[PDB]
Amino acid sequence: MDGRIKEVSVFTYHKKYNPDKHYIYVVRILREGQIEPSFVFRTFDEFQELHNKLSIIFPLWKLPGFPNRMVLGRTHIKDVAAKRKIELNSYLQSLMNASTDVAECDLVCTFFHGSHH
DSSP: OOSSEEEEEEEEEEOOOSSSSOOEEEEEEEETTOSSOEEEEEEHHHHHHHHHHHHHHSOGGGSOOOOOOOOSSSSSTTHHHHHHHHHHHHHHHHHHTSOHHHHTSHHHHHHTSSSOO
């Protein structure tokens, strides 16, 4: 409801068969200046990279918990994708309900800009 991004969510995900490749998460953004949402496409690693970058500049007490994992292979198969849809959504809600200095910072703004980018 905040500064210009008003709503974010992990809308859906897809990909990766005969286990080898990777999932991409579809993120829906609604901004104060638009009527229709925008959509961007982000991997788990991109989310983890965002958290790792924010950790550089912010003490961890200011950030959400990050739902950390991500090997390569051997897993809970890919109920992991389904699980990450929820956990990455909760991360995003927490991030946008953070202190303004975090929720409206350049790292966060950048993450949400650009379909792929």
